[PDB]
Symmetry: D3
Subunit: 162 residues, 6 copies
């Protein structure tokens, strides 16, 4: 076993969702999950066909997001992984829909942080995803006042709680 | 320190395998029920590695070949709370969302009929877990627009899962 | 270039732990609500590893013991976006599905009261990922038709989860 | 040649009722399982109108008071494929998502402790269907910013379902 | 407000599923829910487009079942109602997928019993479903002997329980 | 006997209406969060008829036009535990599955921008429930292969929801 670290580019205003699925129908099912989630949303989806032609398959509505999706696919280089990049939507806007796509088996990351995918290579052409490093270690525990500012952020800034 | 081990997963033609991790003894009867209620003709085996107490591989089936594949696989992986399902006469897409929703199922590793290996970490004597999976082969290149059009044709005219 | 470290998870009698990965600071509030609306008189603590900005283990609880258990285990794992929940007077099967459905939550690694280690990779300093769990111990043998009866009756007559 | 009839629904203090439509005789063990696996020490009784064959009200319970209250609603409503559940030590919120996901359940009409009526149509003798429910009473006015602040306080400080 | 009783034709070997949805996309989404549930299923699905062209939209893989579908729509004749007829699958095989189709708002019946739909016409051309009459009323309460024999059945015959 | 009323539902260009039944007072807050966290732009107004105690129509909103539409329809329906949502900059399919999953939500009556009528049954003074809706118009005929081609191209070329 060889462990390789695959660094994920996230231009600002993007988020990436990286996970695993199966069956070629994953790329059309994911295009439809995203496109029926948020009017407006801009995305690229790529999926690593793990057999047959073994082609990186893709759908997008934005060209920059299609190339990003497709190059992470080629960098990860691991059968059945999929990569989504989104603009004009947050992951929480589309997560549950992705989760319920019957091809989707698991999701490794949903984020905009600094992000590494840990890949095992066990033999040439035989790769899998072993984990992610989504952002950074803690610096401390939150205090009573860090709490207030997080509660006030949710209610006053992004308005997701009352 | 930590030992990594690679398990080759037997996939007789016409089978698919679903590997996951769950908890609690009720896993095995709840998976059994997920499966049987999903596709009228479904043939399956299911095995679950009980991680405490007696620590037996619990199983159910309506096929003996598939029951046996499932138990061997759990004997090879030998990781607490891991389960193994082998299926004939259903595709994983037919069954997978009902597995996800089984209250004991925390996680699913793989669902495939490709060449497949499991990465198991064994950290101590008799203390193993799944690190991950190698599902088929890495990519040979990028789909062209003409590639897209045969896969679209495949989905609409061959398997008819699309209009 | 990768260090694997093993984090042993304390589970005092009567508590189960749930470990997974999420994203976004609303994670702590949504998790709290999923816990408290699931079972009356559940007690629990939940801690979340905010992966950037101030970088704080964020927490909620209605039990002081179970709170510090969770804050502590996040302090030790030290991996961005990991959440840990400890619960009494609730089984993980009474709360898990709600947990799966929290939009922030992306994966669950373990729900258990077994002996448990989390294997963590560190790639640079400060930069850590949960790679897997070792939930309990490996199988000691296959179940026989008598051990099957034991397990069926225990579900029927003792915990009363099946008819 | 349609008559409607109103069925009043007894709800003793500390119970809630759930009434729905389903199908197939497994409805009753599936709803059994859905309830007990949701909350430790929930008390309940569940009844279901089998609409073909021997046409028997089918039932399961861990409380005889709740089980008779459920059978009696079934016998009144007297509509094929309807189910009634009465529960103590659990709120409809602790259990509704699992009920909705039971593959036999097609709709839920009410989950409530309020005063309740079921509107039933009878199209022929022995042929009946639920048309509606009357759950509690019609509004008296519109919430003021002050009523709002007291409802914010009730969910945060009293019940603790929000933060 | 006139109430009108529609009798639903159920051929030996079919089941019927009748609900309410919205938006034209309903018909493709229902077709995909069905065909990705059970490999062998034959079905017909029809949807009552409630605006615009206002037409019965259908998809099928069985002409008989396709027509049974269109025929019950034409009778209920109520905006946004959909009808599905299935051979070689049971409702439990598909129901949850159908629940989670974003266009689907309610399901009124899933069954193979003698069945009536109650339709309210409030205005000409303005109709909606008010209920169903799914088979017949209870003839008695289960005994424990009856309970044993239903449990034996689920366990030994349909094999859905252990 | 029973009094059936017809409530004509106003739907401005650009809005849609979602009408349903829930229970418990936390329904207004949970509906609010299900909307704000489904789509970044979404403008809406939510109202809910509490059906016991104070019996107030409870409301949350970020659009004063749409708050007023939802409160006014609740006042017109005047049926305990019914809820109304008006939304702009989001289609029902964007938010619906989320609504279906709010533990309080028992059922959904309608999701539409079509001419819409709610049929209410008043059964004694102040006891009202929803018996049905009339969502747009009955069929003008049956789709041909010409119109199916046009429909398939509408989904794939105009809205881009299909491929
Ligand atoms: N026709 C099909 N319908 C559904 N799933 C399929 C089909 N063909 C293959 N699969 C699944 O997709 C994987 C990759 O092709 C296979 O290993 C199998 O698991
Ligand atoms: N306002 C927001 N709404 C939804 N998700 C967000 C928001 N801000 C940040 N996130 C997500 O959470 C992570 C920050 O914790 C980001 O990388 C991003 O994925
Ligand atoms: N009575 C019970 N109900 C639900 N879950 C349980 C019960 N007993 C044990 N478990 C779970 O199953 C695991 C043992 O297989 C335990 O670690 C615990 O998490
Ligand atoms: N073995 C079975 N599996 C699934 N559904 C069934 C079965 N038998 C009957 N049904 C359904 O249950 C209804 C009768 O309760 C039938 O009309 C049919 O819809
Ligand atoms: N482009 C679209 N995307 C999503 N939903 C739509 C669209 N157009 C119409 N609808 C919904 O479908 C109903 C029209 O049948 C409308 O009333 C509206 O609720
Ligand atoms: N604290 C509570 N938690 C959950 N559900 C509640 C609570 N109080 C009341 N309810 C439910 O809501 C109704 C009050 O509208 C009651 O009939 C009951 O169903």
């Amino acid at each position: 076993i060889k462990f390789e670290l695959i660094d994920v580019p996230i231009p600002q205003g993007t988020n990436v969702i990286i996970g695993q699925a199966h069956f070629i129908k994953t790329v059309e099912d994911l295009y439809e999950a995203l496109v029926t989630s948020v009017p407006g949303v801009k995305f690229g989806i790529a999926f690593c066909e793990a057999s047959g032609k073994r082609l990186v398959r893709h759908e997008a509505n934005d060209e920059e997001l299609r190339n990003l999706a497709i190059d992470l696919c080629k960098k990860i280089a691991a059968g059945h992984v999929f990569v989504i990049y989104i603009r004009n939507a947050w992951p929480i806007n589309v997560l549950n829909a992705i989760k319920n796509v019957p091809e989707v088996v698991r999701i490794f990351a949903a984020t905009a942080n600094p992000l590494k995918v840990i890949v095992a290579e066990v033999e040439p052409e035989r790769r899998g995803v072993v984990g992610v490093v989504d952002g950074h270690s803690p610096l401390g525990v939150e205090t009573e006042k860090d709490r207030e500012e997080r509660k006030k952020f949710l209610r006053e800034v992004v308005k997701y709680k009352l």
